[PDB]
Amino acid sequence: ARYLGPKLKLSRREGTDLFLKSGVRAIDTKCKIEQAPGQHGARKPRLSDYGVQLREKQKVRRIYGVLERQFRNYYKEAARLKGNTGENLLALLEGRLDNVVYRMGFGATRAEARQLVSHKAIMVNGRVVNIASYQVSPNDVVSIREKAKKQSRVKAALELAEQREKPTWLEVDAGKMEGTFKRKPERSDLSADINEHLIVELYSK
Amino acid sequence: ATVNQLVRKPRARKVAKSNVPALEACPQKRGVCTRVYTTTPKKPNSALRKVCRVRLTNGFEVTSYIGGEGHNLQEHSVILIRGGRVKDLPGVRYHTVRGALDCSGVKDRKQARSKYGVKRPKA
Amino acid sequence: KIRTLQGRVVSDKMEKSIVVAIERFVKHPIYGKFIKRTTKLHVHDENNECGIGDVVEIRECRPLSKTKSWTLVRVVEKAV
Amino acid sequence: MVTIRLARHGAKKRPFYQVVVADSRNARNGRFIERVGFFNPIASEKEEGTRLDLDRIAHWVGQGATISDRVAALIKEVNKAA
Amino acid sequence: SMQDPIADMLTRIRNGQAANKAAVTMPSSKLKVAIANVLKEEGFIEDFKVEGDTKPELELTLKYFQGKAVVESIQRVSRPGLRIYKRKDELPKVMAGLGIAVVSTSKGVMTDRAARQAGLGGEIICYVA
Amino acid sequence: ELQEKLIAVNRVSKTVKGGRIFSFTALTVVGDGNGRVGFGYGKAREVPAAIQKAMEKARRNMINVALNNGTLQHPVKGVHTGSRVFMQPASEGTGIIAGGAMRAVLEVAGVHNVLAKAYGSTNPINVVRATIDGLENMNSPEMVAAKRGKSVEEIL
Amino acid sequence: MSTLEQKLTEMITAPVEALGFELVGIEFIRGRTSTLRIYIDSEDGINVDDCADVSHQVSAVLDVEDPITVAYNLEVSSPGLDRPLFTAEHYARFVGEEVTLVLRMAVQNRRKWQGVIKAVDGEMITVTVEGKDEVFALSNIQKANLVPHFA
RNA sequence: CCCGCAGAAGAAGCACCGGCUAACUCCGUGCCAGCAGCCGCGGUAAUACGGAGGGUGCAAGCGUUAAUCGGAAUUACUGGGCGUAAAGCGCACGCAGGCGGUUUGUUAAGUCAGAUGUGAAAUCCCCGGGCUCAACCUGGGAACUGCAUCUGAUACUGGCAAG
RNA sequence: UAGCUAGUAGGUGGGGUAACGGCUCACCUAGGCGACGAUCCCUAGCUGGUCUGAGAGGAUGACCAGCCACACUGGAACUGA
Ligand SMILES: [Mg+2]
Ligand SMILES: [Mg+2]
Ligand SMILES: [Mg+2]
Ligand SMILES: [Mg+2]
Ligand SMILES: [Mg+2]
Ligand SMILES: [Mg+2]
Ligand SMILES: [Mg+2]
Ligand SMILES: [Mg+2]
Ligand SMILES: [Mg+2]
Ligand SMILES: [Mg+2]
Ligand SMILES: [Mg+2]
Ligand SMILES: [Mg+2]
Ligand SMILES: [Mg+2]
Ligand SMILES: [Mg+2]
Ligand SMILES: [Mg+2]
Ligand SMILES: [Mg+2]
């Protein structure tokens, strides 16, 4: 239950960066990021609003790796909460344990980070956890189990994290490879390319 | 249609006459073809429609379109039927299932074979 | 304080008992229009002392017949 | 008779006991009269697994209710818990 | 047979404001006065006045703001053919509280707002807007 | 800084002595995203012309609705040419839940959170014929206060 | 009567005969739908697919030599469990099975009965109805079907 | 449940790509057929049949059928109609029934307000807690729009009386 | 599917029952029910709820809980709280 094809094809389909590779190189260096995949992938089709909605949904899924059925659960729960639904949807999407680890730069790509979680390498609040979809709470302190604190991948990813913008709501300490989910990240704390309102619109069909 | 007329006569609603009566909510039914025959349409349209008269376990005799590309059926051939209505057929509200119960597994199909029971060919 | 109803007899053709018809004004379930509903009864007319139409007052009691379960308690108008 | 006993709830291999009062003739998870607390055998100090309204109980056994030996022990605990 | 005076009174305003009359009048009644008074102070008209004794008539000075009638939509809800009553909490809101629902309570007749101030259900007579 | 969106294009006939002569009718709306919007509809011999001219008329006719915060101020319906359209403000972040034709209208105007629903026939020109009217018929919490000669809280 | 069913019989018989197949009943219905139904008899068996083969060939000879000018509809059929018997020979082949028949005349005492064949003659078919070995002239029978019962 | 071991090592499929509806070409294909939820499709080329490549969706599942509600304001209480589309009885009288001008008093039935009882638990919902997460289980609450009773309120509707 | 009912409706008395009662019986009265649908006919275990629906509603009563009913068919009782 996880997509395992090539990565860039998605970005080339969704026509943007998705941080699907470690980032040591630029995307165009590795693909035709400007142009969709496939034989007809060169031509620019005349899509629809519905097409827009779907294409934005598949984006936020793919950028996070949630399959379909597990996703709308997030939504169907996100709508149940208070505040702007589509807003807090991303908020809890920002709560997936792996993503936090990835945000904490222990893993270059989320999948790499996900493999760590799945491979029993991370303890939230001292106790081990290995479900990637494990939601996290404020003040939680993830960490690296010593059986992996010497892994070559974790140090290299930490050396790649500062090449990207240091997240605010969560604070890390790369010295001993453990950080703190201080605050629930806000909408502005995320990017702006995401159109959460149409993501709601889609499921509200 | 004033309220005082509703209290003396509440609004009714006609029932949903099942377009698939011979199924009685059964998603499928087993049946035996009591006749096999094909029918061509009028002069302008030239085509062949495969269809069998089949008596069901419930006792009904109906018409079910033969899925096509598998035709091994004749009198006293049992067969499982499902409710599907094809345009251009007046009384055919049922489609014979293809891939079970005395229906030939159609010749190799690389596409949409599950809708014909063809198993994944192991190269 | 005892409970009681205040109906109106419609018949007394039977020995020492009467047929009181209550009248309850109820709002329709769905259509919202208020309506008046009656609940006939079989009240034990002790002494056989009520005419027709004369509005009465009754009270529930242990069974006294196959039908009756109600005792008259007074008359509030005697059938002008 | 009228007894105080344990109805089983929770899930497979994770049982949870609602201590209730009921006519003994009724099924273990059938109807009852007055649920008067709960029991959790697998609390493990994560949460309380013994809350009793023993005065309501006292009121019941006061008027002739009898006690399942399990809850009889449970009652002994909260008293020792004090 | 005029089996409702209030609806008539209202239409006399709707068909009044529409016909762009300066003023309209009705055979008065202690109720209609109370109906007028509340909406009167509620700015939906300028003033009313009643005269005559054996057949007192009520007379209303309609309103127009900018070549447009102030009141523009009127509807009697609780009608003789079907009454309507609402409890305190379910007191409706007209145009998200921009409109006004005139309701009678045991404590008289007032706007819906005043009702849920006193916390009194009652009979919803008209929606005004 | 405007914003436009085509709605529907139909190929209409016109029977002449010899055969017919098709044409193309476009239909579009234009809004400023700030509660000010108009619509246009114009025939032509071929699509881009129609889409062009109809687009231009809509640059006139742009009424100015007094919405508040990407949402309406009160529920409102509007009926025109056999089409009925109910709308009402929605909670924050609810979105634009509306049938196809209306969605653009609501979008370009500046609305963000609104429930909606059509009724009767769903001919696109009719519903926009039936929507903008409904929109302008909104009333600010002071348009009343003014026309009712009161202060804002005096109504609120 | 016979809508020149004679020619219909020859026109269908030729290709059918060419198929090594035997022809049994030809029926045409006009008005409700100008559809013709054909009953065929293959000893090995009759799949729909073969019915298609003959439907195509018969359609071909039908197309050129058709002067009836009715709507061009016709179905190919293989005998049902309830199969019509038209020849005296057909009655002969089904020696001892139930056959229902209706008299052309709608006068009272019409032979709307079914029986079991006891003997078969040309003009006269013996079928047992009400314990009586009746004899029927097939020409005076509007329509008849055999063994509608499924065993 | 933990620890150790070895090795990427033992583990991906099913529909669909004319429109609705996200996703396209090649080759046959010959209206032969076949495709079909509908509209429709097929010729010498078919993005709609078959194969191929490519693509979209979903995933240990994926499709088909069945069944129910929805969409359907398509029984329209909320929330439809009846000149010509279906729909005003041929007309009238009239019982039952429905509805009723205006003022005062009275009543408190309707109505409203409040209280009280009850409305099993589970379920649904909110705030928690516990299984590593989740499903699941669980605390507490909310709610169960109801019903009954009592005490009020009198504008409204009803009753009574007097106009 | 428009009338339905003679233990039917009521009373008196006796019997009967753990208990009230046409429960039963005698006796007397001649009623009782129905368009606010009696009677008849078809269908069906009921509810908490469940699915759907924005809502009102529509559907439904598998699992779990409450209640009822039945135990080859029909009838009868005995014992016993
Ligand atoms: Mg799964
Ligand atoms: Mg598309
Ligand atoms: Mg409906
Ligand atoms: Mg209509
Ligand atoms: Mg007429
Ligand atoms: Mg008259
Ligand atoms: Mg009256
Ligand atoms: Mg009056
Ligand atoms: Mg409950
Ligand atoms: Mg937790
Ligand atoms: Mg009065
Ligand atoms: Mg006695
Ligand atoms: Mg005695
Ligand atoms: Mg609805
Ligand atoms: Mg069961
Ligand atoms: Mg005994």
Swiss-Prot record, chain A:
Could you tell me the keywords of this UniProt record?
Antibiotic resistance, Repressor, Ribonucleoprotein, Ribosomal protein, Ribosome biogenesis, RNA-binding, rRNA-binding, Transcription, Transcription antitermination, Transcription regulation, Transcription termination, Translation regulation
Q: Which GO terms describe its cellular component?
A: cytoplasm; cytosol; cytosolic small ribosomal subunit; small ribosomal subunit
* Pfam families in the cross-refs: Ribosomal_S4, S4
Output the superkingdom of the source species.
Bacteria
By its UniProt entry, which InterPro entries does this protein fall under? Ribosomal_uS4 (IPR022801), Ribosomal_uS4_bac-type (IPR005709), Ribosomal_uS4_CS (IPR018079), Ribosomal_uS4_N (IPR001912), S4_RNA-bd (IPR002942), S4_RNA-bd_sf (IPR036986)
GO MF annotations in UniProt: mRNA 5'-UTR binding; mRNA regulatory element binding translation repressor activity; rRNA binding; structural constituent of ribosome
The S4 RNA-binding domain, residue ranges: 95-155
Q: Which PROSITE patterns match?
A: RIBOSOMAL_S4, S4
| GO biological-process terms attached to the record | cytoplasmic translation; DNA-templated transcription termination; maintenance of translational fidelity; negative regulation of translational initiation; response to antibiotic; ribosomal small subunit assembly; ribosomal small subunit biogenesis; transcription antitermination
Impact of changing residue 50 to D on the protein?
Answer: In rpsD101; suppresses a temperature-sensitive mutant of release factor 1, R137P. Not a ram mutation
Membrane-spanning parts = none
Q: Does the keyword Transport apply?
A: no
> SMART domains in the record, alphabetically?
Ribosomal_S4 (SM01390), S4 (SM00363)
Matching entries from CDD domains are given as: S4 (cd00165)
Give the PANTHER family listed for this entry: 30S 40S RIBOSOMAL PROTEIN (PTHR11831), SMALL RIBOSOMAL SUBUNIT PROTEIN US4M (PTHR11831:SF4)
Give the family this protein belongs to, as stated in its UniProt record. Answer: Belongs to the universal ribosomal protein uS4 family.
UniProt lists the gene as rpsD
UniProtKB/Swiss-Prot annotation, chain C:
One CC-aspect GO term: cytoplasm
Disulfide bond entries: none
Record Pfam families: Ribosomal_S17 (PF00366)
What GO molecular-function term can you cite, just one? rRNA binding
Keywords, comma-separated and alphabetical? Antibiotic resistance, Ribonucleoprotein, Ribosomal protein, RNA-binding, rRNA-binding
Q: Name one GO biological process term.
A: cytoplasmic translation
Regarding protein family, the annotation reads: Belongs to the universal ribosomal protein uS17 family.
The note filed under miscellaneous reads: The strain missing both S17 and L29 grows very slowly and has a rather unstable temperature-sensitive phenotype.
Function, as annotated, reads:
One of the primary rRNA binding proteins, it binds specifically to the 5'-end of 16S ribosomal RNA. Also plays a role in translational accuracy; neamine-resistant ribosomes show reduced neamine-induced misreading in vitro.
Q: How does it assemble?
A: Part of the 30S ribosomal subunit.
Protein name from the UniProt record: Small ribosomal subunit protein uS17
Name of encoding gene: rpsQ
Swiss-Prot record, chain D:
What function is annotated for this protein? Answer: In addition to being a ribosomal protein, S16 also has a cation-dependent endonuclease activity. In-frame fusions with the ribosome maturation factor rimM suppress mutations in the latter (probably due to increased rimM expression) and are found in translationally active 70S ribosomes.
Q: How does it assemble?
A: Part of the 30S ribosomal subunit.
Return the similarity comment. Belongs to the bacterial ribosomal protein bS16 family.
Give me any GO biological process, just one.
ribosomal small subunit assembly
Name under which the protein is recorded: Small ribosomal subunit protein bS16
So which residues are the signal peptide here? none
- State the Gene Ontology terms under molecular function: DNA endonuclease activity; four-way junction DNA binding; structural constituent of ribosome
Naturally occurring in which organism (per UniProt): Escherichia coli (strain K12)
Keywords of this entry: Endonuclease, Hydrolase, Nuclease, Ribonucleoprotein, Ribosomal protein
Statement: the UniProt record of this protein carries the keyword Nucleotidyltransferase: no
Please, which domain of life does this record's source organism belong to?
A: Bacteria
List GO terms (cellular component aspect). cytoplasm; cytosolic small ribosomal subunit; small ribosomal subunit
| A Pfam family matched in the record | Ribosomal_S16
Curated annotation (Swiss-Prot), chain E:
Organism from which the protein derives? Escherichia coli (strain K12)
Does Nucleotide-binding show up as a keyword for this record?
A: no
Q: Name one GO biological process term.
A: regulation of translation
| Keyword terms, alphabetized | Repressor, Ribonucleoprotein, Ribosomal protein, RNA-binding, rRNA-binding, Translation regulation
Pfam families, sorted: Ribosomal_S8
The record's similarity note reads:
Belongs to the universal ribosomal protein uS8 family.
Q: What is this protein called?
A: Small ribosomal subunit protein uS8
Q: What does the protein in this record do?
A: One of the primary rRNA binding proteins, it binds directly to 16S rRNA central domain where it helps coordinate assembly of the platform of the 30S subunit. Protein S8 is a translational repressor protein, it controls the translation of the spc operon by binding to its mRNA.
Q: Name one GO cellular component term.
A: cytosolic small ribosomal subunit
Q: Which InterPro entries match?
A: Ribosomal_uS8, Ribosomal_uS8_CS, Ribosomal_uS8_sf
Quaternary structure (record): Part of the 30S ribosomal subunit. Contacts proteins S5 and S12.
Extract the GO molecular function terms from the UniProt entry.
Answer: rRNA binding; structural constituent of ribosome
